[PDB]
């Protein structure tokens, strides 16, 4: 299956406002998990959110939300009340669970949070 896409490539918002990326993924099955990541300074990927969520991680950061859109392919990945420090590099990843487990990442995008 093809890797998810992650848009827009550059998202500019004002601090205090919401910032919404879209991860798009054509699912040939129900058996996928969609992950949202930020790139750390050391180029380590940090998971912000997942759909379906990790049940072993209850009590997450409510500022990072994932919303499934009705066509079942598109997912809103939203920073609520963006801070200047949220500026950086973001991506989404798809992990198939069955019948064959594998991980595919989207291209990376930039979030710019302005004053």
């Amino acid at each position, epitope marked *: 299956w093809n890797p998810p896409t992650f848009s827009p490539a550059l998202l500019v918002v004002t601090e205090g406002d919401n910032a919404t990326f879209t991860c798009s993924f054509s699912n040939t099955s129900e058996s996928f*998990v969609l992950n949202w990541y930020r790139m750390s300074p050391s180029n380590q990927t940090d998971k912000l959110a997942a759909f379906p969520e990790d*049940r072993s991680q209850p009590g997450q950061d409510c500022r990072f939300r994932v919303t499934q859109l009705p066509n079942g392919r598109d997912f809103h990945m939203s920073v609520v009340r963006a801070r200047r420090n949220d500026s950086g590099t973001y991506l989404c990843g798809a992990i198939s669970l*069955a019948p*064959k487990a*594998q991980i595919k990442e989207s291209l990376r995008a930039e979030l710019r949070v302005t004053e």
Partner: antibody
Framework: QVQLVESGGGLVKPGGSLRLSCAASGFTFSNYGMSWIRQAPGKGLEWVSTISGGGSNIYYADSVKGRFTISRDNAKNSLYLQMNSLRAEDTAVYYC?????????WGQGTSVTVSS | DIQMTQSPSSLSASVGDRVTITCKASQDVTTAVAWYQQKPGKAPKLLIYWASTRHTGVPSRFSGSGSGTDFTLTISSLQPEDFATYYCQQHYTIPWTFGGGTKLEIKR
């Protein structure tokens, strides 16, 4: 918390049938795959069957294909295993489980003994 | 149908020891390997998945590594609650398959 509770195990004669049930709580049932794992006395773990959250992806181990049927009722938060034509080597503890990356939640199991 | 072979079958160790157990797949499973602990009369519990990711609530002394066909689970400093049986599992392809287990016992 996430909870999985199995029921329906018991004693059956070879050739007989038995239906296992599992009640799930503490998560949105329809968003997660479910599975049955079993463990014969003194033996290791053996995967039996898997069903996706919506129920359209279903897989069986060859050892039970044609005899066991997995199913789920998402309105009742329930998982089932219909076991037909049981054999002596189906004797085991059967765990209702849910998976994500690996099998992250396990019930405490229900015992099935197939013997004349 | 991928076969998982664990070794050793059992290992005697003392509290405070570093212990490492091995799991070998009969063919490539990338990094989709999970590890479980099981104590007598109880269900298994998940320790590690995707070969090296420690599951929530698992103590930090547990770690995993490996790829392709060779995988290990390491307990950096054994504690009394750690004596138990350990199973690896490949979660790469259906049918999901498990190693035969390694029993960790108390040296005397």
């Amino acid at each position: 918390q996430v909870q999985l509770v199995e029921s329906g195990g018991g004693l059956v004669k070879p050739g007989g049938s038995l239906r296992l049930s599992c009640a799930a709580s503490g998560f949105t049932f329809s968003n997660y795959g479910m599975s049955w794992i079993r463990q014969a006395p003194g033996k290791g773990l053996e995967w039996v069957s898997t069903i996706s959250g919506g129920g359209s992806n279903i897989y069986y181990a060859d050892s039970v294909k044609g005899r066991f049927t997995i199913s789920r009722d998402n309105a009742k938060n329930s998982l089932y295993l219909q076991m037909n034509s049981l054999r002596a080597e189906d004797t085991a503890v059967y765990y209702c489980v849910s998976y994500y990356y690996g099998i992250d939640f396990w019930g405490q199991g229900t015992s099935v003994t197939v013997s004349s | 149908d991928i076969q998982m072979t664990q070794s050793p079958s059992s290992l005697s160790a003392s509290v405070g020891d570093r212990v490492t157990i091995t799991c070998k797949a009969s063919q490539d499973v990338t990094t989709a390997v999970a590890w479980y602990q099981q104590k007598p009369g109880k269900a298994p519990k998940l320790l590690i998945y995707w070969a090296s990711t420690r599951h929530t609530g698992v103590p930090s002394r547990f770690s995993g590594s490996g790829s392709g066909t060779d995988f290990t689970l390491t307990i950096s400093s054994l504690q009394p609650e750690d004596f138990a049986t350990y199973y690896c599992q490949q979660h790469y392809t259906i049918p999901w398959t498990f190693g035969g287990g390694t029993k960790l016992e108390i040296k005397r």
